[PDB]
Write a protein that binds this ligand. Structure first.
Ligand code: ZN
Ligand code: ZN
Lengths: 310, 153, 153, 310, 310, 310
């Protein structure tokens, strides 16, 4: 009985450092030796009540890459259940009489955890619950980080952009706290910085973390570069163009950078990342996306199967 | 035990007795944990003369006993409360509330995007203490608030 | 008119004593009419031993007197309640709830399009009897409702 | 002063028969001898939170015909307040600091009555508050019944169609119930029958009335024929068709109608009055519409004018 | 050649009592012994021109539970064919050159029957044609009713709510008329009652049926409780809250009820059914939904396959 | 002529203390002795490319109260020009060929200032140009501070709430910085703190001010309490709640406030001022709103009138 058979995937904090390593191992096994009849006869519901591009497509692809069948919806703007009058509860209560597993994105915080309570036996997977959690993103963050460096331990990891609002950025932080010798460079505007609670756990954890004004301030010291997209509408168009200049990445910022160093971004990117970075080795955001396939395959695999023979 | 001023009053047969509830909390608790819903003689001493503790409230539910946990429920409203199990007019024993782990379906998530609002779900917060502030975290939206912010209701 | 004499009683020197409240109406009252939003001494007995009800509800408020309207206000709920004024350990006068004319602040309109719902206003209803039920006409939407309906959980 | 000086016109029930006669009288006079500089310097707010450009235009036209200045709006999803933030109280409160009177249409019932609690001294006129009241329409109506019949007493009044969801018919009946000897005919389809309470006030006040299935049944006795729209939306588009043929007025249907018989209709019609009726003398819905102007002029004059000097 | 191979499923009246029993038998066979490669290589079109939650998802799931492949659309609000200028005819005329069977929901009455005429050989299944028919709902109603009682015969069946507009409620009635000894309690508002035609067939059929004011009036006499949702927008918000009180179900209404007795609802439910009923044995609406799977599987099975070996 | 004759009112910075006093003075006079045929024959354009029916209605009301005629619009997605084709220049250019002055609200900053380059001689008044300026609001504000305090000098002025995204507070402070001895209290949440530049002009001009966390902290010294809305949208709906309890005014909070202390608020309020404050004397937001009428009458008179003869 694999440690995650039949288990729900709501928040990253619900996952041990082992559970993590477990998934990633799987993920890399599966990357090597495809098993496209593994989830045959299973039927999965892909319930996107909020828009998604990567998450909804990568997931369903993962679903077919293992033989599963997909049913579901996207943009439940209002239709019939959820936003228009039916309670999410009741929604789930009936969709779980239909499929073997549920995948869902939802604009409210904690919708996925709620689901848990009405799916009965059927597992739910969190694809984004409001501003709260996004585990499968973070799983494909970790895999990629390890795929390109060889360790999740003792790293120089720099996060940039909206460290205040960017869920993936906190998530990523949380998980890397589970490994040791990892140190953080938080390079964000002060009106957009890493919440203190994060800062506290790192300190209640003993983890080292500085605070840098700009990206090319720390450049030479980092293995992984993590660009979160900055939201202008959350800012004055004047203000948004005030700090902007020193939180955009361009190939010229990259010269002093180590060769071990990779730039990842959860995407989509607007202009935080210049297109000349596109043609540079450190550029690793499209790859990171490809790996979302394996991270999500592994998970589906693990939750629905007793254990594999890989 | 008993209240009086030169004239008797009641000491209920068996049941618990909550006491030293601070002023204008006894009601809350009554409405809050809904202790009034039984059909057994309840006695409520409002704005009684505490003198020493000032003027605390007091409740006496008869033939009803209090679990170790519901006693902890009052940890956040009446930490100085004193709950006495009572048999044959006398005090078999008494506890103080100690801090609970989780506060269930009485509190309410300040987070307005918490799913918890619309849905037929009963709230639950995870109680943690830091300095002198207490911190309840939403079981659903997973957002941590000070006990002063969730304690509007 | 309720005499418990194994665990005796006390009848306050002054203030109002509301008798024969039907059971479980007792909380409903003071929650509805904020009688506990006072610092004066209050004594409440829940699910008491009554001759006519067996289980009755009894509020005792000290150094406090209620307008007839106040008392009339209670007709909807405790139409058999008994307000007793009291001065100098004595019954200075019985009182009785009489069906008012209007019912402000406590009621809630059944009409979900009534503007009283989204705005900061005092619900007001005109009270008319109809030899089967009392009818309540809303101040604002001017819709009339069965009291049975207006009092709906 | 006049009985209505500085009073809020909210419901038709708040008005007395004297109050009615007084307005009707005034109306006849302003219809008769126009006082075009009467409300000069006065500024009136035409607040239509609910669009209705028949009522609006009327009122405003009235307003100018007495020399008042006009400010206001139509549908406040365009307006800046009231979609999520501004209360109606706070809105009336601000508005009533700089206009001389407020005319307001509002989607929620009791909206005009609430206004009065925040307008202070500025008078509030109800131009429709959800299904509740529309006093001016009735005023318009009576003043046309009177001006064509010669009385409000001892009439033979038939109301036809959607008697169940027609606020204007319930008001008319109530109003008309203020006068004596009136006889009522209710020709409506069972799913859309005259509501009980109305029927009881009649029985209670001693007013005679009877239900009928056919106009023809009762044509020869009616002085006033009040038509209503049978909003198909109010029922099955198939169950509608089945009945509709019984409560539609063709020119031909009137051949035995009294000389003085007048066909009335609040507008907009659509299917219930055939256009061949327009061509006849009995047709008085357009005239009845134009009479809306004096009804409203009447009102404006009396509320704003201490002494009506005519 | 099974009696429904290659047959269309438009209206319940098109199905014999045998055809019914046939489907249900299948449905229970399939519930027992899944055959998930049964409709392999068949490709089914799921054409929802109207919104659906249960019907569209349950159907497609049924489709995958038997190996079929799905193509189709939802919310054809206007797009390219149907509402925007292309005729349904032409739509079908081309979609039937594509797939092996068509499933469709459509806002117009009789759209599915029309389809019949242009699909040529390809069968259409009715998923809701306006206010007209909904067979597959009713099929999953009957199965459930039998699954929980053991008979479709000689039952105490109570229907509540919108007996005037609720298609599923008439459908259900029609079908149960095909079995004997069944008796109906119609518990609805008078402004929302069972159309007379229904009432007539029951009487031209000899079937017994009363008319009850409230739910807890008949409570102890019933095996099946059928809650149709009441539409408020079809009612005055005042009126809607007038009868409301005695057409809502709560666990306290359930005490006098038999233990054989089950509450079903076609869903979604708004508030007609209290959540405390949720935790009560009679509560059987979520289950009823689960069974929509098997009812719909059987049907697909039966229409597309010569006959099974189950 | 008057100093402001035929000038464009665009930003509050372009105005002198004399220019301010002059308008404030005039305002008091038109408030005092109304000149209702003063701008008769004049036609004014009320162009609200941005809806704001509080500002609009004010202005227009003003306009009529001086006898001007009014033409204009509200939201020009309804208007025929400016969605893709017409420039604002070409629009002002045409408009300013047939009205006597232009009042305009516009979504883009600098829109009023641009108008001036194409209006030729026709005066342009800014009623809001994106986050830039809203001079009249400030005028309204001062004239209420003055009329209630008795001065604009040596005041104890507290601004509270969203000090970061409150154009009206930045203007007020600037304006108030034109006068001497003024003392400032900035009670704002750190993410929404008084912007640096403003703080520097204070330090620079020698004006005293200090930050505070609690109103209570500083109640007893304030003459004017200027409240702002804390647009939750401006932050995390959870991080909002956490702070909001510190910058919300309840009746009770005022118990030690000076006699002359006046609570101010640009409107619309919503959560920051409890309605129990309305019931108190210190509440002056409605009055402050009505004073908007003279502020604007004042302005209109001076720009359009060579000689203000009062
Ligand atoms: Zn929450
Ligand atoms: Zn109402």
């Amino acid at each position: 009985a694999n440690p995650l058979y039949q288990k729900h995937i709501i928040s990253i904090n619900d996952l041990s450092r082992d559970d993590l390593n477990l998934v990633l191992a799987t993920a890399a096994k599966l990357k090597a030796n495809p098993q496209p009849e593994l989830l045959k006869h299973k039927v999965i519901a892909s319930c996107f009540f909020a828009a998604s591009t990567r998450t909804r497509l990568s997931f369903e692809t993962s679903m077919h890459r293992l033989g599963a069948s997909v049913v579901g919806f996207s943009d439940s703007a209002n239709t019939s259940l959820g936003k228009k009058g039916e309670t999410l509860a009741d929604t789930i209560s009936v969709i779980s009489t239909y499929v073997d597993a549920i995948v869902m994105r939802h604009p409210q915080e904690g919708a996925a955890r709620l689901a848990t309570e009405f799916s009965g036996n059927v597992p739910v997977l969190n694809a984004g619950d409001g501003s709260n959690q996004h585990p499968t993103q973070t799983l494909l963050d970790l895999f990629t980080i390890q795929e390109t460096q060889g360790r999740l331990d003792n790293l120089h990891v720099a996060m940039v952009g909206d460290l205040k609002y960017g869920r993936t950025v906190h998530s990523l932080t949380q998980a890397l706290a589970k490994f040791d010798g990892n140190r953080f460079y938080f390079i964000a505007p002060d009106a957009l910085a890493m919440p203190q609670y994060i800062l506290d756990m790192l300190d209640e954890k003993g983890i080292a973390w500085s605070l840098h004004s700009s990206i090319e301030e720390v450049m030479a010291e980092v293995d992984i570069l993590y660009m979160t997209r900055v939201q202008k509408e959350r800012l004055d168009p004047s203000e948004y163009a005030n700090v902007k200049a020193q939180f955009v990445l361009r190939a010229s910022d990259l010269h002093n950078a180590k060769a071990n160093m990779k730039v990842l971004h959860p995407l989509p990117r607007v202009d935080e990342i210049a297109t000349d970075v596109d043609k540079t080795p450190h550029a690793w955001y499209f790859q990171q996306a490809g790996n979302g396939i394996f991270a999500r395959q592994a998970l589906l695999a693990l939750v629905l199967n007793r254990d594999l023979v890989l | 035990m008993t209240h009086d001023n030169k004239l008797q009053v009641e000491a209920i047969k068996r049941g618990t007795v909550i006491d030293h509830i601070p002023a204008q909390i006894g009601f809350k608790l009554l409405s809050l944990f809904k202790l009034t819903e039984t059909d057994q003689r309840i006695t409520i001493g409002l704005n009684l003369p505490s003198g020493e503790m000032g003027r605390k409230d007091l409740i006496k539910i008869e033939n009803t006993f209090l679990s170790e946990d519901q006693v902890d429920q009052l940890a956040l409203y009446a930490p100085q409360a004193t709950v006495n199990r009572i048999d044959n007019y006398e005090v078999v024993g008494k506890s103080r509330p100690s801090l609970p782990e989780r506060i269930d379906n009485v509190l309410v998530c300040p987070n307005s995007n918490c799913i918890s609002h619309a849905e037929p779900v009963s709230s639950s917060f995870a109680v943690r203490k830091r300095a002198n502030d207490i911190a309840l975290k939403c079981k659903y939206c997973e957002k941590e608030f000070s006990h002063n912010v969730v304690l509007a209701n």
